[PDB]
């Protein structure tokens, strides 16, 4: 599980959670920092070196903006993320 993919993956989870919060009105989800914390906690649960996650915050925000101009409708992106994100969002519950 190479570091750069670790980062793509985690940033995808971060970006999708923000998408949920804002585009799908998941008003139950917390701020971007707690979201980043979770992802980091999650990589640690996997014994991953989070000291290499310098680019993570920025890539996350770059993927989020990509999603907003992606042209897949919001109804669709929200159905998708609401379903696939559940374990991550459960993770957020303890941070």
């Amino acid at each position: 599980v190479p570091a750069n993919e670790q980062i793509s993956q985690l940033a995808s989870l971060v970006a999708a959670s923000k998408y949920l919060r804002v585009q799908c009105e998941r008003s139950d989800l917390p701020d971007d920092g707690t979201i980043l914390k979770t992802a980091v906690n999650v990589a640690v649960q996997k014994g991953w070196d989070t000291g290499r996650y310098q680019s993570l915050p920025q890539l996350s925000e770059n993927l989020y903006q990509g999603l907003l101009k992606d042209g897949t409708p919001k109804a669709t992106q929200c159905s998708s993320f609401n379903r696939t994100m559940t374990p991550f969002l459960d993770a957020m519950r303890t941070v």
């Binding site: 940033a11 999603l67 992106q77 993320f81």
Partner: peptide, 15 residues
């Protein structure tokens, strides 16, 4: 295709 990229990556993660 950011969404496809992102949904794919999420899928990878959950294996």
């Amino acid at each position: 295709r950011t969404f496809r990229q992102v949904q794919s990556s999420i899928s990878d993660f959950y294996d």
